[PDB]
């Protein structure tokens, strides 16, 4: 349970996630120096938390964590199998990550 492929790109659209499945990872960037690694969503059926909070110096599902000290423009996530993301012009649509023959890929969200 860990997707290798990145989410696709539909000509004209935007994708985001709200519900993070247990497994999801984020690396803290800012600048970094502390003795830490990743932020890791962990939990049972009751609730779920984030394990390893981040600091910087000078020189079923879990919500998105509270902003820290020096975040960059973009924050990258490591998704898991099961994860779902949602996709200036009208349309007349959701991307899911699946695994069949030992192969993981995000299904093309038929817009």
């Amino acid at each position: 349970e860990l997707c290798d492929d990145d989410p696709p790109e539909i000509p004209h659209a935007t994708f985001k996630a709200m519900a993070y499945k247990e497994g999801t990872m984020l690396n803290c960037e800012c600048r970094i120096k502390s003795g830490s690694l990743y932020m890791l969503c962990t939990g049972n059926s009751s609730h779920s938390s984030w394990d390893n909070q981040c600091q910087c110096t000078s020189s079923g599902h879990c919500r998105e964590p509270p902003p820290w000290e020096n975040e960059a423009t973009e924050r990258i996530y490591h998704f898991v199998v099961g994860q779902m993301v949602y996709y200036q012009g009208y349309r007349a649509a959701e991307s899911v990550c699946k695994m069949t023959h030992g192969k993981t890929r995000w299904t093309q969200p038929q817009l």
Partner: antibody
Amino acid sequence: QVQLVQSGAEVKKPGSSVKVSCKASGYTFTSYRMHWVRQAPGQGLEWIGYINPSTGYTEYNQKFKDKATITADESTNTAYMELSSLRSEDTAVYYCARGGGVFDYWGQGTLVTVSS
Amino acid sequence: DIQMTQSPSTLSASVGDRVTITCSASSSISYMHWYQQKPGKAPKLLIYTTSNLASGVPARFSGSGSGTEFTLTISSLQPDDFATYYCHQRSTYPLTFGQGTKVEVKR
């Protein structure tokens, strides 16, 4: 079918640097990540990291952070991996393996021997 | 880091025997993968997601397990089956492999 061919064996002096190739065929290059792995003599298998040819973004493990740098280019369909300051402890066989799930398509392997 | 422990390290057996290797994870994991390796070659995928046979693999292989204790079996050893075997996990970073198990011919 899908085939990835690696560069020949190398012998290096301590403190130097070397760059390894892995050319790909039988599929569309930028749709998949490429991973790297080394196998030391006697020792088991160890995962270095990956690259995505669409973006250029890399991820590593907390071992080979400041020792390796994955690189690639879509123009010629090859992935690279440079080793920074060679020590005798770096001696091993280096594999490129294609991503997309569980490892399945590997290269031939490349030997790097480091001594004075 | 999730590290894993294989056992035994070395197995001596005969054509026609039954075989069983074990891999022990430090934490609870969802699936386990297995490879086969012969001298001078890259690893070959053997069993994916804990029990499914890769294409080209003969019916005599399989696997099972859950939680922290996984295992693979061969019901009847053939001559081609002599080699080295590795377990593998991929539910968190970094990715880690097992140490190894070598199957030699008992004489």
